[PDB]
Design a protein around this ligand. Sequence first.
Ligand SMILES: CC(C)CN(c1ccc(-n2cccc2C(=O)O)cc1NC(=O)Nc1ccc(Cl)cc1F)C1CCCCC1
Ligand SMILES: CC(C)CN(c1ccc(-n2cccc2C(=O)O)cc1NC(=O)Nc1ccc(Cl)cc1F)C1CCCCC1
Lengths: 357, 359
Amino acid sequence: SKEYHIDEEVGFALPNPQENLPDFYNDWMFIAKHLPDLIESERVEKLNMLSIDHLTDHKSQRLARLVLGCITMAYVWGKGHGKVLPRNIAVPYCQLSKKLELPPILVYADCVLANWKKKDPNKPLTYENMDVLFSFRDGDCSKGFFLVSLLVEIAAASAIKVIPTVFKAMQMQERDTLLKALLEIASCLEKALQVFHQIHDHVNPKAFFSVLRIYLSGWKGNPQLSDGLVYEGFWEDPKEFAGGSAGQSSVFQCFDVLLGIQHAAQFLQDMRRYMPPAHRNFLCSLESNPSVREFVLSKGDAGLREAYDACVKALVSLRSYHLQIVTKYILIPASQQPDLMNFLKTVRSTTEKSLLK
Amino acid sequence: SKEYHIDEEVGFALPNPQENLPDFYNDWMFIAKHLPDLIESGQLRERVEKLNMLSIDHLTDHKSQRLARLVLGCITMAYVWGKGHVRKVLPRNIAVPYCQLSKKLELPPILVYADCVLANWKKKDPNKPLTYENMDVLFSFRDGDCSKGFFLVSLLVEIAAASAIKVIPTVFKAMQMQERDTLLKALLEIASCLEKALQVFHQIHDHVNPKAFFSVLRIYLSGWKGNPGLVYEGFWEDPKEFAGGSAGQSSVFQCFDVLLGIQQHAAQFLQDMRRYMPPAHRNFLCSLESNPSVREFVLSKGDAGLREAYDACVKALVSLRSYHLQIVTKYILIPASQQPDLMNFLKTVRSTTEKSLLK
Ligand SMILES: CC(C)CN(c1ccc(-n2cccc2C(=O)O)cc1NC(=O)Nc1ccc(Cl)cc1F)C1CCCCC1
Ligand SMILES: CC(C)CN(c1ccc(-n2cccc2C(=O)O)cc1NC(=O)Nc1ccc(Cl)cc1F)C1CCCCC1
């Protein structure tokens, strides 16, 4: 559906992202494409300031934001062992973030949604035929963690395209249409769970926790940048922004809203700001529609209740397996080097309490 | 509109709010309607504690549920604050129905602008118009609190603003259709209506007394988020923080900012205030942000008339925010300097409005 930038094949992800920028931005593209070699070894501070006026289409500006976002995270965090962004990169990065109405920091819509290519376009969207555009460090497992995340967004697209059928069937008092629409969403959410199983085959817990997780960290409520980060020449004062979480996906928040599932309440709302404007306009168009919960309860129909519940159950399954992934990839590795669980459990609890029975 | 519950006459306010609940809720209605007498005699907190737990299942329409929230909200503020000289636990037999009724209406369990302004008025004679002389409130806290004046004058500003809100589709349609003469008239009509809202502000001086406001009424509008939380017995085992009433709970304040492209620590506060607004009204301010920028449209065009009409709106907003500040001065600053960061926030918002002028 065109106005909201939801793709029929990949949903919220960006279809066929640009891989190359105009020559004018070669200095950017060289740094971003060589980050593994370049981190172990100043070029950002010796970098001239480029105008953003030569980024003319949407995909170019998304790729440019991805390039500048990966550069910024690597400059701030370095080698990842232990506060001011140079004017000549921050001014174009903040200008390009302002234009696209996103915060000047690496966000899920950059390094997942806009950070993939097909290897051969004549074949389908599977891990074996897919790759990422940018990494941080050799062995960071960027490829696996980004692509498996993206394959979940694609699986979710199968359900999102069913979403006009739900509201049309409510308007037209069509009980049999709405039931099939809910079961199809439920079935697609159940197939998304099977993708989650793929993380184990492409992402290594240690590599994730001690390498990749430092470069997705932001600077809002971070003790290393207690006052935040200074974007030299744009604000004289340092500014806080969060870094990447699963909460920046629209997938997670989208089906809460649809199914009428209502401190963590605060966090998912702010995460929407870190989403593309079209996608936030979509989640709002959703909240303006009649409650699927009020509709299914008001009918007294037990078939409809089971289908609504089929959706809610598929979400609880996902949130449990999510939780189990956090156990393998954060809790256990943290107990090996010499409040995230509370947030996830609370969100899971609110979902489970939304069953009808 | 329709889906957003914006009325052509009163805008964001609730039209013709219910005044009476079903008999089943007489025990509630007695306390709320007699809060002045029951606080002054020391019988308020006893009447709340001798209260059986009532099901909310007999509140069947919207207006009934809005009135019940107002009744329970006024009771809660009086129970928490007492004689204004407090209670850390709200008794289960009122908190459970109040929290249940808040969940249904998707509002926080505390008295909010949509309760004691938007849903808390009646006409004296319906055959005559909406003026202070023909209007009254449903609930007060204390004899002499000047609740009537402060609530109704607050609401009369919301009503003046409604005249402009219904123009808001004309603005977006006229941009889409490249109709330059239509869009100009739409801004001037909004500006003129924003200018009439300023004339309502003048009425506060005739119906609200500064001392009465600061030392009485302001105690019963105090919340418990960042207040030097409250336990809702039987609903949460843990105490919960929620803010009390501010002018920020109006949609009026944010609505014309969004239209005009006015970008409003304080960015966070106006954003959090939206939760204390009705869900339909939160969907409207959000549906607004999804529309094209009126600022970017007027600027790309070389037409100076359009700039002056956009500025006419922005200027009318700056006028209101200056006079706002002067009202804050009379009703807080001076009485506080007589007893033995809101000013920073208000000036900042004025600066952001003023800095959005085109000239
Ligand atoms: C698609 C999402 C909703 C579910 N997944 C997921 C599950 C658990 C975790 N997780 C592990 C430890 C802590 C967390 C957490 O914080 O939740 C993270 C994610 N996903 C991201 O972190 N995505 C992401 C965010 C920001 C930036 Cl910048 C880049 C990114 F790639 C996919 C699903 C299938 C298995 C692979 C991961
Ligand atoms: C409606 C807004 C945009 C402008 N006004 C306004 C101006 C200054 C102040 N003020 C004074 C001292 C501190 C403050 C402050 O904190 O701003 C308050 C209000 N208005 C409310 O506070 N309304 C209200 C809110 C919450 C609850 Cl619960 C109940 C209520 F009645 C009206 C407009 C009509 C002329 C009288 C004032």
